[PDB]
Write a protein that binds this ligand. Sequence first.
Ligand SMILES: [Mg+2]
Ligand SMILES: [Mg+2]
Ligand SMILES: [Mg+2]
Ligand SMILES: [Mg+2]
Ligand SMILES: [Mg+2]
Ligand SMILES: [Mg+2]
Ligand SMILES: [Mg+2]
Ligand SMILES: [Mg+2]
Ligand SMILES: [Mg+2]
Ligand SMILES: [Mg+2]
Ligand SMILES: [Mg+2]
Ligand SMILES: [Mg+2]
Ligand SMILES: [Mg+2]
Ligand SMILES: [Mg+2]
Ligand SMILES: [Mg+2]
Ligand SMILES: [Mg+2]
Ligand SMILES: [Mg+2]
Ligand SMILES: [Mg+2]
Ligand SMILES: [Mg+2]
Ligand SMILES: [Mg+2]
Ligand SMILES: [Mg+2]
Ligand SMILES: [Mg+2]
Ligand SMILES: [Mg+2]
Ligand SMILES: [Mg+2]
Ligand SMILES: [Mg+2]
Ligand SMILES: [Mg+2]
Ligand SMILES: [Mg+2]
Ligand SMILES: [Mg+2]
Ligand SMILES: [Mg+2]
Ligand SMILES: [Mg+2]
Ligand SMILES: [Mg+2]
Ligand SMILES: [Mg+2]
Ligand SMILES: [Mg+2]
Ligand SMILES: [Mg+2]
Ligand SMILES: [Mg+2]
Ligand SMILES: [Mg+2]
Ligand SMILES: [Mg+2]
Ligand SMILES: [Mg+2]
Ligand SMILES: [Mg+2]
Ligand SMILES: [Mg+2]
Ligand SMILES: [Mg+2]
Ligand SMILES: [Mg+2]
Ligand SMILES: [Mg+2]
Ligand SMILES: [Mg+2]
Ligand SMILES: [Mg+2]
Ligand SMILES: [Mg+2]
Ligand SMILES: [Mg+2]
Ligand SMILES: [Mg+2]
Ligand SMILES: [Mg+2]
Ligand SMILES: [Mg+2]
Ligand SMILES: [Mg+2]
Ligand SMILES: [Mg+2]
Ligand SMILES: [Mg+2]
Ligand SMILES: [Mg+2]
Ligand SMILES: [Mg+2]
Ligand SMILES: [Mg+2]
Ligand SMILES: [Mg+2]
Ligand SMILES: [Mg+2]
Ligand SMILES: [Mg+2]
Ligand SMILES: [Mg+2]
Ligand SMILES: [Mg+2]
Ligand SMILES: [Mg+2]
Ligand SMILES: [Mg+2]
Ligand SMILES: [Mg+2]
Ligand SMILES: [Mg+2]
Ligand SMILES: [Zn+2]
Lengths: 91, 248
Amino acid sequence: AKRTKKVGIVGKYGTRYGASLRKMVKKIEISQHAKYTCSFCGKTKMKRRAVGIWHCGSCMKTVAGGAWTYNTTSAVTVKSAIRRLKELKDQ
Amino acid sequence: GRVIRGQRKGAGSVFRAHVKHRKGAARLRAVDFAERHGYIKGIVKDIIHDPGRGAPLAKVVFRDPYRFKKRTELFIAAEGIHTGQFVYCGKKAQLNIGNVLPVGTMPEGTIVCCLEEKPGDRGKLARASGNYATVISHNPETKKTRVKLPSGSKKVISSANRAVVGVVAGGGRIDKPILKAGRAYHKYKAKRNCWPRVRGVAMNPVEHPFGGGNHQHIGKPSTIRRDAPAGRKVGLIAARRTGRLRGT
RNA sequence: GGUGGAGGUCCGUAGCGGUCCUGACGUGCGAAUCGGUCGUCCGACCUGGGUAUAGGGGCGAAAGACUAAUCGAACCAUCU
RNA sequence: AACUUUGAAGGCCGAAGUGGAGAAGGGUUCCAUGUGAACAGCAGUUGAACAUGGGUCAGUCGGUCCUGAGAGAUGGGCGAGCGCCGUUCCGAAGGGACGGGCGAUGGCCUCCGUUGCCCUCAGCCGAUCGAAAGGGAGUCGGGUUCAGAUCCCCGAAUCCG
RNA sequence: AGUUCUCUUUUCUUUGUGAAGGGCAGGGCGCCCUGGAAUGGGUUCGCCCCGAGAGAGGGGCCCGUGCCUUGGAAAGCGUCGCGGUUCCGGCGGCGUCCGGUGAGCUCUCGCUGGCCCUUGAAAAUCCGGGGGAGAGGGUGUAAAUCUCGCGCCGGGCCGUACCCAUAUCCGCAGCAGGUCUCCAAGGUGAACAGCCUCUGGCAUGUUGGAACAAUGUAGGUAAGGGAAGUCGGCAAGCCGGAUCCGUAACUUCGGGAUAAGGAUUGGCUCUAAGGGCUGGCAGCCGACUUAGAACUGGUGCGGACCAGGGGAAUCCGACUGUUUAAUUAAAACAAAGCAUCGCGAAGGCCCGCGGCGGGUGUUGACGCGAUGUGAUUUCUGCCCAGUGCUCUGAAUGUCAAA
RNA sequence: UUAGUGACGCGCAUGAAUGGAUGAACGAGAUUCCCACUGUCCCUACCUACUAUCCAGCGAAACCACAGCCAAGGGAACGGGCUUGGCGGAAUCAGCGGGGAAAGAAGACCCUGUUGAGCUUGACUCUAGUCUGGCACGGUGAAGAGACGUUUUUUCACUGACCCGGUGAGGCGGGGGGGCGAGCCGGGCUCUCGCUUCUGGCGCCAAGCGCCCGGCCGGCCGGGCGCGACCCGCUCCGGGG
RNA sequence: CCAAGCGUUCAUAGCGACGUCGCUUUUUGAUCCUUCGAUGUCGGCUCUUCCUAUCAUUGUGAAGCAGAAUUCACCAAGCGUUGGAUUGUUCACCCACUAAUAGGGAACGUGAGCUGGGUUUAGACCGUCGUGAGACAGGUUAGUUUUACCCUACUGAUGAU
Ligand SMILES: [Mg+2]
Ligand SMILES: [Mg+2]
Ligand SMILES: [Mg+2]
Ligand SMILES: [Mg+2]
Ligand SMILES: [Mg+2]
Ligand SMILES: [Mg+2]
Ligand SMILES: [Mg+2]
Ligand SMILES: [Mg+2]
Ligand SMILES: [Mg+2]
Ligand SMILES: [Mg+2]
Ligand SMILES: [Mg+2]
Ligand SMILES: [Mg+2]
Ligand SMILES: [Mg+2]
Ligand SMILES: [Mg+2]
Ligand SMILES: [Mg+2]
Ligand SMILES: [Mg+2]
Ligand SMILES: [Mg+2]
Ligand SMILES: [Mg+2]
Ligand SMILES: [Mg+2]
Ligand SMILES: [Mg+2]
Ligand SMILES: [Mg+2]
Ligand SMILES: [Mg+2]
Ligand SMILES: [Mg+2]
Ligand SMILES: [Mg+2]
Ligand SMILES: [Mg+2]
Ligand SMILES: [Mg+2]
Ligand SMILES: [Mg+2]
Ligand SMILES: [Mg+2]
Ligand SMILES: [Mg+2]
Ligand SMILES: [Mg+2]
Ligand SMILES: [Mg+2]
Ligand SMILES: [Mg+2]
Ligand SMILES: [Mg+2]
Ligand SMILES: [Mg+2]
Ligand SMILES: [Mg+2]
Ligand SMILES: [Mg+2]
Ligand SMILES: [Mg+2]
Ligand SMILES: [Mg+2]
Ligand SMILES: [Mg+2]
Ligand SMILES: [Mg+2]
Ligand SMILES: [Mg+2]
Ligand SMILES: [Mg+2]
Ligand SMILES: [Mg+2]
Ligand SMILES: [Mg+2]
Ligand SMILES: [Mg+2]
Ligand SMILES: [Mg+2]
Ligand SMILES: [Mg+2]
Ligand SMILES: [Mg+2]
Ligand SMILES: [Mg+2]
Ligand SMILES: [Mg+2]
Ligand SMILES: [Mg+2]
Ligand SMILES: [Mg+2]
Ligand SMILES: [Mg+2]
Ligand SMILES: [Mg+2]
Ligand SMILES: [Mg+2]
Ligand SMILES: [Mg+2]
Ligand SMILES: [Mg+2]
Ligand SMILES: [Mg+2]
Ligand SMILES: [Mg+2]
Ligand SMILES: [Mg+2]
Ligand SMILES: [Mg+2]
Ligand SMILES: [Mg+2]
Ligand SMILES: [Mg+2]
Ligand SMILES: [Mg+2]
Ligand SMILES: [Mg+2]
Ligand SMILES: [Zn+2]
């Protein structure tokens, strides 16, 4: 059964810290505790070990990722930019 | 009056960095013949949390070109590198995330991290989590490069300075509210004795310029000149302006 | 409807603290203790030993607090 | 003899103890015998008092060794100077070794040791101190005294060299 | 051994086996081989696992502190009975037995998960592997060599008593203070609560006797009223456990909430339901629970103990946290959040008499340093004259030494 | 109802991060009212324990000019003493709190002192630090502008002082040698390169070749050198200066 | 005290101008004589006593005293003079009962009698003021109340000549 209407994971904090801060931290709490599909082995096991450190329990690979998400939008953009500059550099 | 807290921070004592569980200084490779003239290969063995640092660190292993040994380096982990990956350092390394190249060979607009302030210093700029520098331009005649730093300042550096391609991992860390004094207690228990911070107006005049009064007020302007003596230089130090930053 | 068992979460012991009685005592058991009643009790928690900071100095989640019953500048000897 | 000892009753602490053992601190207060001057805020035939004598046994339980936060010499620097800073930093920082070649001495003189020199090889990169709660091989059962016992004796083991 | 007037095949006590070696249970494996799975299956309290190989078969390894065995019955213990100098490790008989059970408590081993802007020592020391420089003998009188089984010798130095705390320590003392730990029984009960008891311990806390006046200190009880007392309900009192029902304003939708408000609760005799093992059934074992019913007492039943009074509002501070050791615990401090300011290292901020000195810094702007405000919500208006801070400067008044 | 709450607002002297307004939850924080409850009270009583009490033993201390009954008087303007009156009778016990302007501590308040100390600043006089100019360390060379071959100054360079960073000071500069390209009439040059990028392997302690030498009987056994691994150089390599 | 007036009339039932004479020390002042090697600083509570300048009650005289109610005066302090809301309050105001709800002193009686609400230390907030440290007969909140066993007095208890 649905146990809360809107707090969800930030129901652990009760009434404290304010609705907007709890609303903000809810987005991060879901993402930083999610299990992502590993791109090396395909199993949904990519889990955060520390801030910025993501580890897959199946293939044992470790990845330098984002603080709360597996990869950041900034890092994804930079990889494409570095890929494009590499082609032009050697044509 | 007595010596103020800011004065006492300089003597070391209870204000020294908490470095008991840190893993070592994060650095590039020391520049040698392989990086000067070609490239050297390495393998990312592990990516580890460093107490007190937001960014993760990568443990990279190289071969020693002169002795039968394995060299373990401790790099700032660029975002997207994984264990078992091969990284390459040197003049002729390819433009890939995690490789170490001189900024002179990088095309304009390259995104780099752990960039040398001076050629050979082994990486000093843009090392915080999520941060990076950019390459603006080169002057092959003067053998120098123009980069943009995470603060936004533009700097002219030698073209021979090395850097790691990509941005530092662990980005977006400051986007999470701490929500708790206790969580800030733990953040700084790994760094140094700087928390919590008592306000100047909350003290007596003996230990602070702003202390004292029947009302908690500064009483004197809080923008303090650049040349004020230690123990007086408190508040907004040499402020060019104050108030809300409205506009660009 | 169940399962699950988070929390600077709540009642409450050990522990840690010390609100009120303006209770006891006030040539005291005690140069600060005693009783009931009370705060908190997974955390910014409690605590042993080691080690560091020394007097216009330290150290202070800040009361001019603490720095060996001494603190709006310790104690000791000297100047005297 | 209200208070000591024995016996018997009636009670209390009520396994977070008023029980059984340690650390720090004490330092003989421990145990036996004697005294009842002084002390133990009454008394005492009693005491942790006084007096006369005893009592602490280890490869295996700790220290001892390691490093921790840290402390601290040398090189160097500073300093009128006692000295101070500094701990890898302005240093010719190794007194070692498989092996090989030249000799010298000895002995179970057969040939091997030891020993001197030369050749060869050599990162550790920091003297030293720092924990009776951290790391750190290996001992247990029974008996035994007034007081000691995983230490003594009996039996059975084990680590290191 | 106790009780035995009556009853009680009763109540109480007690009923071993060390280290090390061997074997075997048990536990664990992210170890191997066959094979190839959707009608997906396996599986936990939860999870979680699989074509990167699931189920199902057959193996391997690690720990085995459990049991057996050597130790080892010779000892220890219980009990009965004999001896001595009788201060003997004295000598004999018998015994040291068979099962069950548990979210029980304590310890431990293991598996699996959660939390971190926290990621939770170093070294001495020991080991395995990769390589193959070398060495060993020429078929024997075998050699180099051996982390295998026996056997031989040694292990020095210092500590070691006792107290460990309402009398061995610190507070001038045998001071109601302070002072770090380990073990931890039965009953009631949710319980390391309180109350009673066993093992162990003690003698009432630096004296006794006799009285039972006032005034005290500490406990109680009071007709009728019910805060009229007092600055103020200070103090005391009321409520209180559990089950069943029921629960508002407001709210940041998490709460408020044990809101508020009711009913019930003992004893006894029953009924039903909830499981395991062996071979839709049969038999044999069992662990406390829940619900319901009758009967029953002078309506007494959470019978002691344990154990929230409640509601409507206003001010302040968001909260948890901290503080004037010894008159102030608070609205003060901190806090997350918010906003400013300096700094790209020959740097910012700071220490230092001193230097190629030192802290931040094992750091690098998502950082470090310096201030203000003080969660969230909503907003943060006008003023650069003053005082500050800051920016430009040979264009340029005053302006030291040289 | 000098209290509380809600309104009003020309507000002595409210007001926007010297933050304004709010608001759930929370509070040993301040305040008002209501239910319940009661000895807070009307208005007190009784009971229990330990005292006090009396006894045996044992046994302090604070304090003390002499002392210790009052009325009035006058008096340093509130007498235990003095004057005038009232009056006065051993030694003691339990209580008590009127007095002793009781004890306690050379008044903290207030003033004075040519006595201080903590703190502040637009006080006076200084001072660490800091910014700034000059002189020295402190050099080499080109230009520009001046002054009379010398000399001042500006710019640009240099390195060798001086500083910084890295490293176990491990391949620096120049030349040679070699490879792919270009292009002029096979050779010379423009000019560039120095052998590693797929995979979570391995990688040292030289192979090979050339030339010498030793011991033993062309054959065995064993050494030395060189190339492999280019040569020459004055700062280890960079960055400043 | 005088008496212009008021009181329909009428100075004096009851009042009383312009003037003037006193008393009191429960108001505030003025002064600075005592106390700064300290006389505990408001209010309440509690408890006794005293004054009279009499509110009530007893006995009376006078009224513009018909009665009732009331007013003025005399002897007079024997006995009374209350319960409450707001406030720390003294003071004040209101509710209610009453014969009446009088006024005062006793070191502005009374803190080794209490309480500690206010004032009046150190913490903290607001406003105004100050550049500031800080200040404010301006608000606010929290803030240790010591000793009797001596002498006397008093209360009771033995006793003494
Ligand atoms: Mg100052
Ligand atoms: Mg303060
Ligand atoms: Mg809690
Ligand atoms: Mg709680
Ligand atoms: Mg008290
Ligand atoms: Mg007393
Ligand atoms: Mg702390
Ligand atoms: Mg200092
Ligand atoms: Mg203060
Ligand atoms: Mg004990
Ligand atoms: Mg003992
Ligand atoms: Mg005695
Ligand atoms: Mg003894
Ligand atoms: Mg030193
Ligand atoms: Mg040592
Ligand atoms: Mg040790
Ligand atoms: Mg032995
Ligand atoms: Mg299987
Ligand atoms: Mg036997
Ligand atoms: Mg091998
Ligand atoms: Mg012992
Ligand atoms: Mg007793
Ligand atoms: Mg006794
Ligand atoms: Mg005692
Ligand atoms: Mg006692
Ligand atoms: Mg009653
Ligand atoms: Mg009644
Ligand atoms: Mg009242
Ligand atoms: Mg009253
Ligand atoms: Mg109360
Ligand atoms: Mg409520
Ligand atoms: Mg309001
Ligand atoms: Mg608070
Ligand atoms: Mg603290
Ligand atoms: Mg205090
Ligand atoms: Mg307190
Ligand atoms: Mg500000
Ligand atoms: Mg301005
Ligand atoms: Mg009221
Ligand atoms: Mg109002
Ligand atoms: Mg504004
Ligand atoms: Mg304001
Ligand atoms: Mg006596
Ligand atoms: Mg006198
Ligand atoms: Mg006389
Ligand atoms: Mg008196
Ligand atoms: Mg006095
Ligand atoms: Mg004085
Ligand atoms: Mg004084
Ligand atoms: Mg004078
Ligand atoms: Mg002075
Ligand atoms: Mg001073
Ligand atoms: Mg001046
Ligand atoms: Mg007339
Ligand atoms: Mg005078
Ligand atoms: Mg005079
Ligand atoms: Mg006096
Ligand atoms: Mg007095
Ligand atoms: Mg009269
Ligand atoms: Mg008075
Ligand atoms: Mg008095
Ligand atoms: Mg008093
Ligand atoms: Mg008060
Ligand atoms: Mg105050
Ligand atoms: Mg102001
Ligand atoms: Zn994976």
